[PDB]
Design a protein around this ligand. Structure first.
Ligand SMILES: Cc1cn([C@H]2C[C@H](OP(=O)(O)O)[C@@H](COP(=O)(O)O)O2)c(=O)[nH]c1=O
Ligand SMILES: [Ca+2]
Length: 131
C-alpha cells in the first residue's frame, strides 16, 4: 500500500469525510472501523475528533487497500492520515471507534487496529468505559 494526497472538502462524522477525488466530490468511509452515529453516545466526540484531526493537518493523505475502493453505496474506502498519523487507528486507540467491517482482502491494518483496540479496552476509554 502507499499513501497519496487527499483533498478535503468537509468533515462529515466520526468515520466519514468528504474528499475531492479526481475532481469528484465523494464520501469516504474509513476502513476497518465503526464510530457511533452523531446522535448516539460518543458520536459528537468521534465527529469532533475526526474533524479536527483531518482539518488541522497540513498533510492530508489517503491509502487504499488491496481490494475494493468503493463500497455498495458508492463511498470511497480508505485509511486516512493526518500528518502521517492514521485517523482510523487514532479513533480506535482513543475508544471512539470499534474495529469493525473487517473484510478479507481489505484488511491490511487489521492487527494494528486490534492492538489499539485492546489498549483502549484495557484503559476503559469511551465506548469501553463503565459509563
Ligand atoms: C466500512 C465498510 C462498510 N461497508 C458497508 C457495510 C454496511 O452495509 P449494510 O449497510 O448493508 O449494513 C455499511 C455500514 O456503514 P456505516 O457504518 O457508515 O453505516 O457499509 C462496506 O461494504 N464496506 C466497508 O469497508
Ligand atoms: Ca458508523
Amino acid at each position: 500500500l502507499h499513501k497519496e494526497p487527499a483533498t478535503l472538502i468537509k468533515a462529515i462524522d466520526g468515520d466519514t469525510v468528504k474528499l475531492m477525488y479526481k475532481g469528484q466530490p465523494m464520501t469516504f468511509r474509513l476502513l476497518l472501523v465503526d464510530t457511533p452515529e452523531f446522535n448516539e453516545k460518543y458520536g459528537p466526540e468521534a465527529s469532533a475528533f475526526t474533524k479536527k484531526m483531518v482539518e488541522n493537518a497540513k498533510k492530508k493523505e489517503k491509502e487504499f487497500d488491496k481490494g475494493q475502493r468503493t463500497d455498495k453505496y458508492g463511498r470511497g474506502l480508505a485509511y486516512i492520515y493526518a500528518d502521517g498519523k492514521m485517523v482510523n487507528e487514532a479513533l480506535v486507540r482513543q475508544g471512539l471507534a470499534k474495529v469493525a467491517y473487517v473484510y478479507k482482502g481489505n484488511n491490511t491494518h487489521e492487527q494494528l487496529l486490534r492492538k489499539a483496540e485492546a489498549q483502549a479496552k484495557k484503559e476503559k476509554l469511551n465506548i469501553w468505559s463503565e459509563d
